[PDB]
Design an enzyme around this catalytic site. Structure first.
Site, PDB file in Angstrom:
ATOM      1  N   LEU A   1       0.835  -1.191   0.000  1.00  0.00           N
ATOM      2  CA  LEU A   1       0.000   0.000   0.000  1.00  0.00           C
ATOM      3  C   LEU A   1       0.872   1.245   0.000  1.00  0.00           C
ATOM      4  O   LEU A   1       1.898   1.302   0.682  1.00  0.00           O
ATOM      5  CB  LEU A   1      -0.924   0.015   1.219  1.00  0.00           C
ATOM      6  CG  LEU A   1      -2.248  -0.746   1.113  1.00  0.00           C
ATOM      7  CD1 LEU A   1      -3.203  -0.067   0.152  1.00  0.00           C
ATOM      8  CD2 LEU A   1      -1.991  -2.173   0.672  1.00  0.00           C
ATOM      9  N   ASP A   2       0.468   2.235  -0.783  1.00  0.00           N
ATOM     10  CA  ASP A   2       1.146   3.516  -0.777  1.00  0.00           C
ATOM     11  C   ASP A   2       0.676   4.346   0.411  1.00  0.00           C
ATOM     12  O   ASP A   2      -0.274   3.995   1.115  1.00  0.00           O
ATOM     13  CB  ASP A   2       0.884   4.266  -2.080  1.00  0.00           C
ATOM     14  CG  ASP A   2       1.459   3.558  -3.288  1.00  0.00           C
ATOM     15  OD1 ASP A   2       2.487   2.865  -3.141  1.00  0.00           O
ATOM     16  OD2 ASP A   2       0.879   3.694  -4.385  1.00  0.00           O
ATOM     17  N   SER A   3       1.361   5.465   0.640  1.00  0.00           N
ATOM     18  CA  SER A   3       0.920   6.384   1.681  1.00  0.00           C
ATOM     19  C   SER A   3      -0.476   6.911   1.378  1.00  0.00           C
ATOM     20  O   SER A   3      -1.380   6.822   2.216  1.00  0.00           O
ATOM     21  CB  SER A   3       1.913   7.535   1.819  1.00  0.00           C
ATOM     22  OG  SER A   3       2.224   8.102   0.558  1.00  0.00           O
TER      23      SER A   3
END
Ligand SMILES: CCCCCCCCCCCCCCCCCC(=O)OC[C@H](COP(=O)([O-])OCC(O)COP(=O)([O-])OC[C@@H](COC(=O)CCCCCCCCCCCCCCCCC)OC(=O)CCCCCCCCCCCCCCCCC)OC(=O)CCCCCCCCCCCCCCCCC
Ligand SMILES: CCCCCCCCCCCCCCCCCC(=O)OC[C@H](COP(=O)([O-])OCC[N+](C)(C)C)OC(=O)CCCCCCCCCCCCCCCCC
Ligand SMILES: CCCCCCCCCCCCCCCCCC(=O)OC[C@H](COP(=O)(O)OCCN)OC(=O)CCCCCCCCCCCCCCCCC
Ligand SMILES: CCCCCCCCCCCCCCCCCC(=O)OC[C@H](COP(=O)(O)OCCN)OC(=O)CCCCCCCCCCCCCCCCC
Ligand SMILES: CCCCCCCCCCCCCCCCCC(=O)OC[C@H](COP(=O)(O)OCCN)OC(=O)CCCCCCCCCCCCCCCCC
Lengths: 446, 54, 134, 146, 112, 66, 84, 85, 241, 55, 97, 151, 53
Positions: free
Chosen positions: H39-41
């Site tokens: 997951l990205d930020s």
């Protein structure tokens, strides 16, 4: 009238017998009841006794003191709890009360002055003896030295009146009208100080913040009235001179009332805020008094009775909170509705009375001073609107801020309100309402 | 303890109370003197005197 | 526990601005079908800047934040049951020590409850002494 | 607990060695500390804190020692906290427009419509009818038909 | 209708609540008179408000007679209310004709 | 804090009293409105004709002939 | 228990015609909506109805019965010789 | 009514499964978002927003950094609702 | 009381009182009565401060609906507020709210208005402050000061109306229509009506008072403070018109 | 119900002061007898006067 | 059953105070009600009668209610007394000057 | 009782009146005693003009007399106000025609009241009121009635 | 209280009632009815007309 005096004198020995603290108030409350039966007074003096009489004006002020001085004993139960020189403390009040009774019951102007100031010294002992904070010194002197500085010149003005009138008796004085400018300033600048006026009030916030609970009662209860009562007797023969310089006093008190109300909003101390509230209302009392009209005179007499009971009442509540929270600052005292919800009711009723809420006796007097001032000049509507508006601005801030919010965090556990405290609050407020029924008596002193 | 008559304080205090008192005390004296002058001169008939009962 | 440290990374400033931007978007377009449509586009605008230098990004946040504030709603949504909400912390519960001042007859209406509290008081002191060194 | 005389501010700080003790005396690291200008109405060496958007703009979710004041344990208190308190003149977010803008719009609208209303006070729409013919003595009111 | 015409050409529009300005018998071979029905005593005895003391008083008095006869169920007197309103409608017409008359006359004088 | 709670779902069924009440309230309103329209249709429109002042003749107003 | 948490497998994005309108738009724009399967539960027709059903019911609830009572009211009035 | 802990475990996972940029297999109580699930930020922000709407409150941006696995989110909601059962 | 909800006790009292007042209003409509009872406190300079009550259909009728609505709002609150605390505290305020509005309605005297008028200014404030959040504090403070302007206005009107020797305005309003004093009384009373009715620019407080519990909002914004200013003008309609 | 004890027995001393105080002023009124029934507003009619003076 | 202890400050003192006040106010009300009931029902009011030709009323005769007659007769000084003492005192005081 | 409710109205008025009249007639009135109370009469006393400038008893006599007369004169205005008060309530809606004479009586009384006690304020006494009159009369003969100004 | 102890002319306190004139309508007794109070002494009598003095 001597019935009262000799009753008090023979109650002096009760200060010496031990375990007689509570038997004193009953003798002090019972005498109020006895005094409460002998109301058959008129505008002119009645019940003469060697130099002591009483008219409707003096009666209400005397009866106010007996009531207030009796509540002092209820309020200051901590002195009894810690046996903190209680015997001496009792003797201070019994002496102090006698000086007041003589001051109002005196028929001659020289006597009024003789017991006028003499009551001060019993008050001065009260502050130093039983005050907590170190500043009772630096507030002990202000009370003594503002008063003495302006009362000593008054003594000269009194004697100068013998050599013209030939007597001190109030009725004989009213036959004269004087034209000397300085004499006007030697019999009103001495009472304008004790009212107090806005610019010479610097002693009032110090004396009240530092004095004990009982000292706060009498300082706010009867001392501010001796200035008011004195004026009501000595503007009778200063009518001509009063017209040349009244506009100076009216403006100062009116503008003084407004400015102090803003000062109230920026306070953060309960004792300070209530004390500054005294200057605000006392500005209206003085303003209407110097208008000299029938309404301004009857109204001023009324409001002095009502305000004393209220401001004395509000000093009870500050003491109750201070006794437990230990600090008198507004920041400490928050959300007390959630600690002492039964107490918060009394906070409201006494607070509401201070803002001229009905059906209190306070609103009856305030309607009248407002009438006299408006009749005096339609320009007075400007601040008289502001002053009545802001006179509620700080009262809500006083009540709401101290009762509503979320509770303080650092406070340690403390007792809840006791029956003594509730009974004390009732006796303050409940007469302040029922008196409206018989304002017939405590209004028409002229 | 930290007060000083520094001019800013004087300028603050001057406009703060002294002039509101002075200007308004002047207004009261002015308005009443004008109103008083009529009464002394006999201008207002007793029919027209305001606040008869005050 | 852990007390948050005030220093906030640049990566976090973008994160917060993204959260505020979306929440502001809901207020303007309440409806979910519309909201999800526009919220997707909003996320696109961030991905078209994800590949940029930080110093360039410093310029992005500045105009990114100002336009948000320049487009703040006149009645932003909150959650009624949380900080800033219309119904936040309506009730206030006094501290525990209130109970101990009840009249002894009052305590007799809940004898079990006050029986337990005084067992807890014994445990609390030993717990408190250990935690803070007595 | 001490008393006020033991806590009143010291005279305005003049030296760095004096500043550091002053900053120590208020539990402030030496960079926050900033006494008032000492024009002559100054508060002595008391710090200058807050004066921003107000108390309510402080982080609500932080675990304050005193959540009610939104203040920490020994932290000093701004000299005008009574004015920037949560219920007094403070806001959660910066106002959208300049303070002057709001007054102009409301008053500008109000004046713009005061004149319009009063200009039309003469041009009252009236139904096409004559006045009530209240029966007065010695006056002659007719009915149209013969 | 409207009242801009009165603003733009005031010479023709008599104006709001216009009191007649021409001789009542002008332009009439004759015009019959108007008759009261309710005396002063009758109006006062029923406390008829002064703005309602116009020519319709007798019907208004009849309305109170019946209305007081069945109070609170005044709907049992809905029939009587019709006549009083039926009559006061006529007065509004008379005021209308009185207005048009002046408007028509005021036009004539401009022409000549 | 209603004792009823539903997750990603419509609320439970309704008791007989609530089901009936909704119709009775709504139905009672309409019954009133219809009846007044039936019996008093002359209130929405004018209960008295607004006369066309223009239609009046110069003679019936006694307008003198130029 | 107060409720039961249904399974994510149950919610299928193709059920709701309104949400599907979003996807064809995003495909044209070239994006994809991850948080779309969540919204499905709000638009279940059998338990929430549509815009049309909710509007018809809200305005005209009881109108059918309200009219029927009125006919009885006119019946009594006629039987009391009031309508004419 | 009381919010049982088991339901919190169900409610959290339901939302995550509905999230289309996650694996229903890897998804478990212990998995990490940015580490395991990729997951990205910004993606992690959107997840919290779902969590907020899921239970009805604000998760402060400062405190969202502690929420790096669904177990932490489960613990967080439990702490806020003080359901320790 | 210890076994009866104060809401259950309260409802029967108000509704019965409301119902009785409704019958009277009908009686006063039929006879077109006007009753004016008054008790006297003190008199001077040919003047008299009194409590006065004016009973006509207009006063009595609207007094009834204040009770009818209030009774049901209390009963409604039996379930709305069962859940938190202090139901006894809340209802005792609402009852004090009815009586204050009651005395406002009946009052034909300018001074006597202050009894109900200021009592509304205070009791209304307490209800807005009922919740302990900050938002309620700011809301409550705004209303009281907003209404305190109206409170100030009436105080000055009392001084001006002294010129006519009384405070029974319902008798002099129509014979003193021209003189400057009535225009000065009507001027101030207009502000007192505008503030309670939340007109421009005083409108700001009425939306702010939504911080109160929903039963309060029904009482304050349906049959009380919002309507207070209207009724006052209805009694002053001559000079205003 | 009073809740008074033997300590209130000392109360008689203040009550003693009351009677003594009452006695003196009552004795003072007996010294006030030169406008008694002689003033223009209450003075007795000249001739055929009441034996006992009012007050 | 199933209820949760909600912590609130004690009310006993306030509950006791309301009781004590109610007791002692009653403790005075029953007497005065007895007196006022006895006075009005048995003694009753006077009747405003015109003064006889040459009759001097005692000061208490000048009032209506029986209780008010009692107070003015045995509890208070007659108005004449205070009026005529004041005349003496003003006389002597004027002689001072 | 032509109205239905008025027929019900009178029914209640019988219920509330019936007992009280019986109670008044049964207990209160029969058991009471006969007793008469009188009305104070004050012999007129010399006015302040006769008083010397050195005696205080004579001044005190007049000051009290002036004050009593003030009350009588304060409220003779009050009675006249109540008449116009009552006519406006007993004669509406046509009350202007009937109260107009009563108000004329009222306004005249106020002026005479204000010519006599007016503008003295509190502390007004026999001496002050009489001295206003002396100054007023002097101005009248010199400048005519007030309101016309001086010459 | 309002039937016997109502305020009268011999006291100031007490409740004082000034009722208006009932609407006399046709069918009522003597329809052409007039206010019997004509002279000023009629108004605000407060029972003074029937006093013995
Ligand atoms: C005298 C002592 C007394 O018995 O008071 C009356 C007593 C109030 O105390 P309580 O009965 O124990 O009420 C406690 C609640 O049940 C339970 O509630 P609580 O114990 O938590 O206390 C609730 C409340 C207690 O106060 C109230 O809830 C309202 C009580 C009614 C007002 C009574 C005082 C009215 C004075 C004006 C006259 O205390 C507060 O904190 C309220 C904040 C202050 C707001 C006061 C608003 C009224 C102002 C009146 C303005 C007049 C215009 O109740 C009455 O008998 C009513 C008065 C009879 C007339
Ligand atoms: C706003 C300011 C309001 C001030 C108080 C207004 C008066 C309210 C009550 C009047 C009243 O007490 O009724 C008087 C009457 C009492 O009689 P009364 O006051 O009318 O006079 C008769 C004689 N005295 C005064 C001796 C009683 O009714 C009652 O007091 C209630 C029954 C007795 C308790
Ligand atoms: C008229 C002319 C005569 C006036 C009266 C003169 C006599 C006044 C003094 C009489 C009291 C003397 C004894 C006394 O001081 O009271 C006792 C006590 C003083 O304190 P303490 O040292 O504890 O006394 C122990 C002795 N019993 O009591 C106290 O605590 C206070 C005593 C009063 C102090 C006043 C100074
Ligand atoms: C309430 C406070 C207002 C009271 C008003 C008032 O003072 O009484 C007015 C009226 C007196 O009117 P009056 O002219 O004397 O009529 C008889 C003439 N011979 O006195 C009257 O009330 C008489 C008119 C009767 C009106 C209807 C019957 C009286 C009902 C009183 C209320 C009680 C109703 C109970 C309802 C129970 C419902 C469950
Ligand atoms: C004139 C405009 C209409 C009348 C408004 C009167 C009251 C104005 C100020 C008080 C108020 O409105 O209440 C709310 C106010 C702050 O509330 P808030 O909106 O939440 O903003 C800061 C807190 N977050 O609360 C406060 O800030 C506390 C206020 C403390 C008291 C000082 C307020 C002085 C207001 C002067 C207004 C000028 C009008 C009055 C002057 C004429 C009076 C005759």
């Amino acid at each position: 009238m001597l019935k009262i005096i000799f009753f008090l004198l023979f109650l002096i020995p009760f200060c010496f017998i031990n375990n007689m603290y509570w038997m004193v108030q009953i003798m002090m409350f019972f005498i109020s009841f006895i005094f409460l039966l002998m109301n058959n007074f008129m505008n002119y003096w009645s019940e003469i006794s060697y130099f002591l009489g009483c008219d409707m004006l003096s009666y209400g002020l005397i009866l106010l003191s007996l009531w207030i001085c009796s509540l002092m004993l209820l309020a200051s139960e901590m002195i009894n709890k810690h046996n903190n020189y209680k015997n001496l403390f009792l003797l201070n009040i019994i002496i102090l009360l006698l000086l007041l009774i003589l001051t109002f019951s005196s028929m001659s102007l020289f006597m009024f002055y003789l017991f006028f100031e003499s009551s001060l010294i019993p008050t001065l002992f009260l502050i130093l003896g039983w005050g907590y904070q170190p500043e009772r010194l630096q507030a002990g002197l202000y009370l003594l030295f503002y008063t003495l500085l302006v009362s000593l010149p008054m003594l000269i003005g009194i004697f100068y009146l013998m050599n013209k009138i030939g007597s001190m008796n109030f009725y004989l004085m009213n036959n004269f009208m004087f034209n000397y400018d300085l004499l006007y300033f030697c019999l009103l600048c001495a009472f304008l100080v004790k009212m107090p006026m806005f610019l010479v009030h610097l002693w009032l916030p110090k004396a009240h913040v530092e004095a004990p609970v009982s000292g706060s009662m009498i300082l706010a209860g009867i001392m501010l009235k001796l200035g008011g009562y004195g004026m009501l007797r000595v503007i009778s023969f200063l009518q001509l001179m009063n017209l040349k310089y009244s506009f100076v006093w009216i403006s100062i008190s009116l503008v003084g009332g407004v400015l102090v109300s803003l000062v109230c909003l920026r306070q953060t101390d309960l004792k300070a805020l209530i004390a500054y509230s005294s200057v605000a209302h006392m500005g209206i009392v003085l303003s209407g008094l110097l208008t000299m009209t029938y309404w301004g005179l009857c109204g001023s007499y009324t409001l002095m009775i009502a305000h004393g009971l209220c401001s004395s009442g509000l000093f009870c509540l500050a003491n109750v909170s201070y006794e437990r929270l230990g600090s008198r600052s507004m920041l400490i005292n928050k959300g007390l509705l959630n600690f002492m919800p039964s107490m918060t009711l009394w906070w409201f009723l006494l607070s509401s009375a201070n803002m001229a809420a009905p059906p209190t006796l306070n609103l009856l007097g305030e309607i009248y001073l407002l009438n006299s001032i408006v009749s005096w000049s339609w320009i007075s509507m400007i601040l008289l609107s502001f002053l009545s508006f802001f006179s509620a601005a700080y009262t809500l801030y006083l009540y709401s801020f101290s009762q509503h919010g979320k509770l303080f965090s650092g406070v340690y556990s403390f007792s809840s309100g006791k029956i003594r405290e509730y009974l004390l609050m009732l006796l303050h407020w409940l007469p302040l309402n029922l008196l409206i029924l018989k304002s017939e008596s405590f209004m028409l002193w002229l | 303890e930290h007060f000083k008559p520094t001019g800013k304080s004087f300028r603050t205090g001057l406009f703060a109370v002294v002039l509101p008192i002075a200007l308004y005390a002047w207004a009261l004296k002015a308005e009443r003197d004008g109103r008083e002058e009529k009464y002394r001169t006999g201008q207002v008939a007793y029919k027209d005197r305001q606040f008869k009962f005050i | 526990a852990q007390v948050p440290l005030a220093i906030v990374s640049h990566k976090r400033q973008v994160c917060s601005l993204y959260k505020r931007a979306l929440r502001n978007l809901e207020s303007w377009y309440d409806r979910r079908n519309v909201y999800r449509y526009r919220a997707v586009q909003l996320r696109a605008r961030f991905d078209e800047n994800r590949s940029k230098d930080l110093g360039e990004g410093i310029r992005l946040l500045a105009c990114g934040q100002r336009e948000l504030f320049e487009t703040r709603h006149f009645q932003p949504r909150n959650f009624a049951n949380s900080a800033g909400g219309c119904a936040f912390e309506r009730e206030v519960i006094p501290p525990d020590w209130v109970l101990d001042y009840w009249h002894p007859l009052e305590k007799a209406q809940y004898p079990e409850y006050f029986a337990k509290r005084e067992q807890r008081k014994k445990e609390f002191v030993t717990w408190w002494e250990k935690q803070y060194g007595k | 607990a001490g008393w006020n005389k033991d806590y009143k501010p010291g005279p305005y700080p003049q030296t760095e060695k004096e500043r550091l003790a002053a900053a120590k005396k208020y539990y402030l690291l030496p960079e926050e500390y900033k006494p008032y200008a000492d024009d002559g109405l100054g508060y002595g060496d008391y710090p200058k804190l807050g004066y921003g958007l107000g108390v309510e703009a402080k982080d609500s979710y932080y675990p304050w020692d005193y959540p009610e004041h939104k203040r920490n344990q020994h932290e000093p208190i701004s000299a005008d906290h009574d004015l920037y308190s949560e219920d007094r003149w403070s806001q959660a977010e910066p106002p959208r427009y300049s303070n002057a803008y709001y007054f102009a719009c409301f008053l500008g609208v109000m004046s713009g419509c005061l004149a319009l209303y009063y200009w039309l006070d003469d041009k009252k729409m009236y139904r096409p009818v004559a006045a009530k013919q209240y029966p007065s003595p010695g006056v002659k009111h007719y009915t149209f038909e013969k | 209708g409207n009242a801009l015409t009165h603003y733009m050409k005031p010479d023709v529009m008599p104006g709001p609540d216009v009191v007649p300005t021409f001789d009542p018998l002008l332009g009439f071979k004759s015009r019959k008179e108007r008759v009261m029905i309710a005396t002063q005593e009758e109006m006062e005895s029923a406390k008829l408000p002064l703005e309602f003391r116009d020519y319709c008083a007798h019907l208004a008095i009849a309305y109170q007679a019946c209305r007081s006869d069945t109070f609170p169920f005044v709907y049992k007197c809905a029939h009587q209310k019709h006549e009083y309103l039926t009559c006061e409608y006529e007065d509004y017409v008379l005021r209308m004709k009185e207005f048009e008359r002046e408007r028509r006359l005021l036009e004539r004088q401009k022409r000549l | 804090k209603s004792h009823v709670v539903s997750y990603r779902n419509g609320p439970p069924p309704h008791s007989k009293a609530t089901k009936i009440g909704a119709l009775t309230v709504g139905g009672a309103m309409w019954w009133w409105v219809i009846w007044h329209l039936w019996h008093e249709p002359d209130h929405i429109t004018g209960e008295f004709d607004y006369p066309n002042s223009r239609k009046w003749s110069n003679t019936e107003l006694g307008v003198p002939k130029d | 228990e107060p409720y039961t948490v249904p399974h994510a497998s149950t919610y299928k994005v193709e059920s709701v015609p309104q949400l599907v309108e979003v996807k064809e738009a995003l495909g044209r724009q070239g994006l994809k909506d991850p948080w779309l399967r969540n919204e499905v539960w709000r638009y279940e027709p059998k338990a929430f109805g549509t815009h049309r059903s909710r509007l018809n019911t809200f305005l005209f609830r009881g109108l059918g019965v309200g009219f029927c009572a009125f006919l009885a009211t006119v019946a009594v009035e006629y039987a009391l010789g009031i309508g004419k | 009514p009381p919010l049982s802990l088991k339901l919190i475990n169900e409610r959290v996972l339901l939302v995550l499964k509905l999230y289309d940029k996650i694996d229903p297999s890897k998804l478990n109580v212990e998995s990490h978002f940015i580490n395991d699930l990729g997951l990205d930020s910004l993606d992690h922000v959107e997840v919290i927003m779902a969590m907020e709407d899921e239970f009805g409150f604000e998760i402060p941006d400062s405190d969202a950094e502690k929420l790096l696995k669904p177990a932490d989110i489960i613990k967080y909601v439990a702490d806020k609702e003080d359901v320790y059962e | 009381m210890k076994y009866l909800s104060i809401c259950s006790i309260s409802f029967v009292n108000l509704i019965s009182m409301s119902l009785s007042c409704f019958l009277l209003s009908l009686y006063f409509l039929l006879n077109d009565m006007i009753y004016f009872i008054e008790w006297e406190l003190v008199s001077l300079n040919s003047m008299s401060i009194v409590m006065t009550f004016l009973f006509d259909w207009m006063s009595l009728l609207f007094m009834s609906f204040v009770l009818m609505i209030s009774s049901l709002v209390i009963f409604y609150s039996k379930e709305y507020m069962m859940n938190d605390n202090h139901i006894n505290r809340f209802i005792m305020l609402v009852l004090m709210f009815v009586l204050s509005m009651m005395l406002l309605i009946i009052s034909p005297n300018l001074i006597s208005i202050l009894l109900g008028w200021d009592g509304l200014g205070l009791v209304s404030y307490c209800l807005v402050i009922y919740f302990q959040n900050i938002k309620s504090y700011n809301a409550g403070m705004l209303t009281a000061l907003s209404n305190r302007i109206g409170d100030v206005a009436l105080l000055l009107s009392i001084a001006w109306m002294l010129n006519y020797g009384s405070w029974n305005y319902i008798f002099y309003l129509e014979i003193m229509q021209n003189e400057f004093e009535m225009l000065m009384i009507g001027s101030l009373v207009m502000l007192a009506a505008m503030t309670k009715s939340a007109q421009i620019p005083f409108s700001s407080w009425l939306p702010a008072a939504m911080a109160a519990p929903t039963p309060v909002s029904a009482l304050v914004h349906s049959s009380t403070l919002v309507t207070a200013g209207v009724y006052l003008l209805i009694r002053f309609n001559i000079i205003l018109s | 119900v009073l809740g008074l004890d033997k300590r209130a027995l000392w109360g008689a001393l203040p009550l003693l002061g009351f009677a003594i105080g009452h006695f003196l002023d009552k004795k003072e009124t007996e010294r006030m007898t030169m406008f008694r029934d002689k003033s223009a507003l209450y003075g007795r009619p000249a001739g055929s006067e009441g034996k006992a003076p009012s007050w | 059953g199933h209820h949760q202890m909600i912590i609130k400050p004690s009310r006993f003192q306030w509950d006791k105070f309301k009781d004590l006040l109610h007791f002692y106010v009653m403790l005075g009300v029953i007497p005065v009600t007895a007196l006022v009931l006895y006075a009005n029902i048995f003694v009753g009011p006077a009747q405003l009668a015109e003064i006889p030709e040459g009759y001097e009323p005692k000061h208490w005769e000048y009032e209506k209610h029986p209780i008010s007659r009692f107070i003015s007769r045995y509890i208070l000084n007659s108005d004449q007394q205070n009026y005529e003492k004041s005349l003496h005192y003003l006389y002597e005081e004027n002689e001072k000057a | 009782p032509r109205s239905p409710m008025a027929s019900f109205a009178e029914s209640v008025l019988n219920v509330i009146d019936g007992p009280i009249t019986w109670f008044r007639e049964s207990i209160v009135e029969p058991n009471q005693q006969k007793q008469n109370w009188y009305h104070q009469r004050f012999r007129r006393v010399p006015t302040i003009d006769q008083c010397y400038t050195d005696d205080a008893v004579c001044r005190f006599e007049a000051d009290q007399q002036f004050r009593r007369d003030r009350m009588v004169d304060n409220e003779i205005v009050n009675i006249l106000r109540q008449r116009f008060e009552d006519c406006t309530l007993y004669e509406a809606p046509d009350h202007m025609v009937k109260c107009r004479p009563l108000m004329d009586q009222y306004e005249k009384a106020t002026e005479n009241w204000f010519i006599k006690y007016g503008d003295l304020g509190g502390y007004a006494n026999a001496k002050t009121a009489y001295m206003k009159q002396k100054h007023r009369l002097i101005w009248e003969r010199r400048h005519g009635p007030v309101g016309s100004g001086m010459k | 209280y309002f039937k016997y102890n109502q305020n009268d002319w011999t006291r100031k306190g007490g409740w004082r009632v000034i009722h208006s004139r009932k609407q006399c309508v046709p069918g009522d007794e003597g329809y052409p009815k007039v206010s019997d109070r004509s002279a000023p002494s009629d108004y605000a009598a407060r029972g003074f007309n029937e006093s013995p003095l």
